[PDB]
Paper text:
A highly-conserved meiosis-specific structure, the chromosome axis, assembles in early meiotic prophase and provides a scaffold for the organization of chromosomes as a linear array of loops, and also orchestrates the formation of DSBs and their repair as inter-homolog crossovers. Mammals possess two such proteins, SYCP2 (1500 residues in [name]) and [name] (254 residues), which are both required for proper axis formation and wild-type levels of crossovers, and are known to interact with one another through their C-terminal coiled-coil domains. Mammalian [name] is known to form coiled-coil homotetramers that self-associate into larger structures both in cell culture and in vitro, but how [name] cooperates with SYCP2 to mediate chromosome localization and axis assembly is not known. We further show that both SYCP2/[name] and ASY3/ASY4 form heterotetrameric coiled-coil complexes that self-assemble into extended filaments, paralleling our findings with Red1.
We combined the truncations on both proteins to yield a minimal construct, Mm SYCP21325-1479:SYCP3105-248, which we term SYCP2CC:SYCP3CC hereon. We found that Mm SYCP3CC also forms homotetramers in the absence of SYCP2CC (not shown), and when we determined the structure of Mm SYCP3CC by x-ray crystallography, we observed an antiparallel coiled-coil homotetramer similar in structure to H. sapiens [name]. As SYCP2 and [name] share limited sequence homology in their coiled-coil region, we reasoned that [name] homotetramers may form through promiscuous coiled-coil interactions in the absence of SYCP2. To compare the stability of Mm SYCP3CC homotetramers with Mm SYCP2CC:SYCP3CC heterotetramers, we measured their melting temperatures (Tm) using a dye-binding assay. We found that the SYCP2CC:SYCP3CC heterotetramer is more stable than SYCP3CC on its own (56.0°C Tm versus 52.5°C), supporting the idea that the heterotetrameric complex is the preferred state when both proteins are present. While the SYCP3CC homotetramer is likely not the favored state in the presence of SYCP2, its structure may nonetheless be informative as to the structure of SYCP2CC:SYCP3CC. Overall, these data show that the SYCP2CC:SYCP3CC complex forms an extended coiled-coil tetramer with an overall structure similar to that of the [name] homotetramer. Using sequence alignments and the structures of H. sapiens and [name] [name], we generated physical models for SYCP2:[name] where the monomers are arranged either parallel or antiparallel, and mapped all identified crosslinks onto these models. In agreement with our SAXS data, the crosslinking data strongly support a heterotetramer model with two SYCP2 monomers arranged parallel to one another and antiparallel to two [name] monomers.
Author numbering:
A (entry chain C): 108 to 215, 221 to 237
B (entry chain D): 111 to 211, 218 to 237
C (entry chain B): 112 to 238
D (entry chain A): 111 to 238
The structure:
Amino acid sequence: KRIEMYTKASFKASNQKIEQIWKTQQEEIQKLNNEYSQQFMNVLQQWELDIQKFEEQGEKLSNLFRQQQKIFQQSRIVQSQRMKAIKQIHEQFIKSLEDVEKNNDNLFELKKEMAMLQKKVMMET
Amino acid sequence: EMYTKASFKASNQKIEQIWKTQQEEIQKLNNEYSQQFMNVLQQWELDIQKFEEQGEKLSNLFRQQQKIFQQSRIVQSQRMKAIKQIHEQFIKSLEDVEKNNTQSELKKEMAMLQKKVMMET
Amino acid sequence: MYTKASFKASNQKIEQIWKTQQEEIQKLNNEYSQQFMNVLQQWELDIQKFEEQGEKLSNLFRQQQKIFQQSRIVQSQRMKAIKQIHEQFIKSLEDVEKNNDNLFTGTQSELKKEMAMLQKKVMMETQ
Amino acid sequence: EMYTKASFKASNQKIEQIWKTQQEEIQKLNNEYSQQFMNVLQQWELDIQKFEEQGEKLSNLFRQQQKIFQQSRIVQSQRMKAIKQIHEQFIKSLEDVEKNNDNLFTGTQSELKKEMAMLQKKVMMETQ
């Protein structure tokens, strides 16, 4: 009766110390598991922030690309437009000279003035 | 009279000849210029097309690198989301097993030990 | 006297015609050279502005290259850091498991020491 | 005396067995996680290489295209010189031809006046 109670008290105190040994070692493993999770969680949050900066950086240069691209197309067509222009100018020059040369054949007007000088000459004689 | 008309006609010739001789010189100057000019302009049309084609390629190369740029951003963000998924599953699993535990089965076998020491005593 | 007068009259009218026709030509020549030079100088500039944009592209291409290189570098740092964290975790468990398995200070020996005490405590008052 | 020592030793061994089996379960989870984790890192490390290989290949195709762009800009300048030269020589030739035509003694007006002056002399001579 009494012996049986005293041995129940001591079992409950040993049981308590046996738990605490188990708990202490599981608490220590938990602080490692947690400390490991925070460092691991902070590295992915940093990487996420890094991808954010990465994408914001790439987006500016996408707009910068665009402005140069419209300017780059305009300069291209002007380079070919100028060139057509000088071809046009040369072709109108050459044609306006051919046109002149045609009236040269008409003039070889001289013979008219000589026939007139000859008429005056004979009239004298 | 005949002697006059003859004289006028030989003179008329020599004057028309001086003129045309002088015209032909310039018109041969004109002709060789046009030809040389139009020949160089024509290969130049080609060269300037080539120019515009290299500038066109350099422009496609940027479009290719921005594609890769965005492809790299998508695959990082997916790898990163999957790393985080495995980790959170692992943490939840440990949290699950901890919550389950152990201290009762200790108390059970201590009861059994007590039972046999009461029995023996 | 009459014949010489009308000969010099004709000569002058002849020299003028030659001269007019020459002035027309030389007017076309100089008008053409003038335009030609104005449009070539202008072409020299537009060509030189094309180089400018083609050069700004190169600098934007190179700019993105560096950024592309920089992400790569950072990613490899981010990976090197989370590998170092993980392996520091893993070895930290190994060393915790090492102390718990200790023949004289680990948890099984501390259990046995409690069981050692309880059993003599119970035997003492019972017998 | 003997009955209690062997009863206590059997229970030591049972408890330590309770301990071990839960420890083995946790170490099972830690190992399965470590494998899966070191698996996605090696894929990430492959990912890193594949974009560098894409980066590097584009960089070298870009320098090649810029070199060809620069050899096309040099050609624009050579074409410019040639056409400038050809026009310069045309004008300069035009000028030389008009001086020679405007020479006082041998120009084309003084050939027009010489021809004219013979003709006038042919006419007068005979009429006398």
